[PDB]
């Protein structure tokens, strides 16, 4: 019945409907920081957000979306890996329901209480659903929080999310500005992978942010407050949307870093 995260419909049993699931790219996986290698030709990344125009929230009944308007290049992701120009679409976080789990990157199998996914699209390809079906379609930035000092810059989203608590939910989510939501640090770890979600499609470059940000144990809690169910239907917390590691496979990470 639908996937999602339960023990009926979760990763486990994703691959039924999405064979891909079991396929050669698959996202996440574990960084081993002691394998992954510097790899001298990266370029710094470009991270340009100061026109980013957001526009809604969103409780999908499997995270919440901040989305943003892709019609034209107004917050772009460039530089890195990558080639060509990126346009960031939509935001949105993986959580657990405690402090020590919750991202779907670990770092040396290391589990963070959640995780930030900037999800942009390659220009070249004109729109989002055209980008998905290729290889080089999406870049995703990867920043995983931890639980610490409050992050100024996520409290106007906690403060939205009672307004948006179950599926289907949306709610004005205007001059929103991303680059709160960033750690100092732009070093990285790269990868080629997939969508974490079904369809779980094999078209990303994955960037994980190696500085985390730390966000307060009443923001997180407050993720934890969200609902997978719809309206009227009995509750299920929104806790534990994030799918495990997955084999690495015939993949190198590298390293912008030394
Ligand atoms: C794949 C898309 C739905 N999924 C996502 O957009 C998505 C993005 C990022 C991740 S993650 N967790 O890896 O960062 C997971 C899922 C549906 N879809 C298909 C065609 C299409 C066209 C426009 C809009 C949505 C469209
Ligand atoms: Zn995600």
């Not at 030709?41 to 957000?49: A, E, G």
């Not at 957001?54 to 999908?60: E, G, K, V």
């Given at each position: 019945?639908?996937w ?10 994703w ?6 699931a ?17 790899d001298p ?9 100061d026109?980013?125009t ?49 991202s779907?990157?670990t ?23 055209k ?40 709610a004005?989510?205007?001059?929103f ?26 078209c990303?470059t ?23 169910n719809?309206?009227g ?21 590298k390293?912008?870093?030394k």
């Open positions: 019945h639908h999602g995260y339960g023990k009926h419909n979760g990763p486990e049993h691959h039924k409907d999405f064979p891909i079991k396929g050669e790219r698959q996202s996440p996986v574990d960084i081993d920081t002691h394998t992954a290698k510097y030709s990266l370029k710094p990344l470009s991270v340009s957000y026109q980013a957001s526009l809604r929230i969103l409780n999908n009944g499997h995270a919440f979306n901040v989305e943003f308007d892709d019609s034209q290049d107004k917050a772009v992701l460039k530089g890195g890996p990558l080639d060509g120009t990126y346009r960031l679409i939509q935001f949105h976080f993986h959580w657990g329901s405690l402090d020590g789990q919750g779907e990157h770092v040396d199998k290391k589990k963070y209480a959640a995780e930030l996914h900037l999800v942009h699209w390659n220009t070249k390809y004109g729109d989002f659903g980008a998905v079906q290729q290889p080089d379609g999406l870049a995703v930035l990867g920043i995983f929080l931890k639980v610490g000092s409050a992050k100024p810059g996520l409290q106007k989203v906690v403060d939205v999310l009672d307004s948006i608590k179950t599926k289907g939910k949306s004005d989510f205007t001059n500005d991303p680059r709160g939501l960033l750690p100092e640090s732009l070093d990285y770890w790269t990868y080629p992978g997939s969508l974490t979600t079904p369809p779980l499609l094999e990303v994955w960037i994980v942010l190696k500085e985390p940000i730390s966000v307060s144990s009443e923001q997180v809690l407050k993720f934890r407050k969200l609902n997978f719809g309206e239907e009995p509750e299920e917390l929104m806790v534990d949307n994030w799918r495990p590691a997955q084999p690495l496979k015939n993949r190198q990470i390293a912008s870093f």
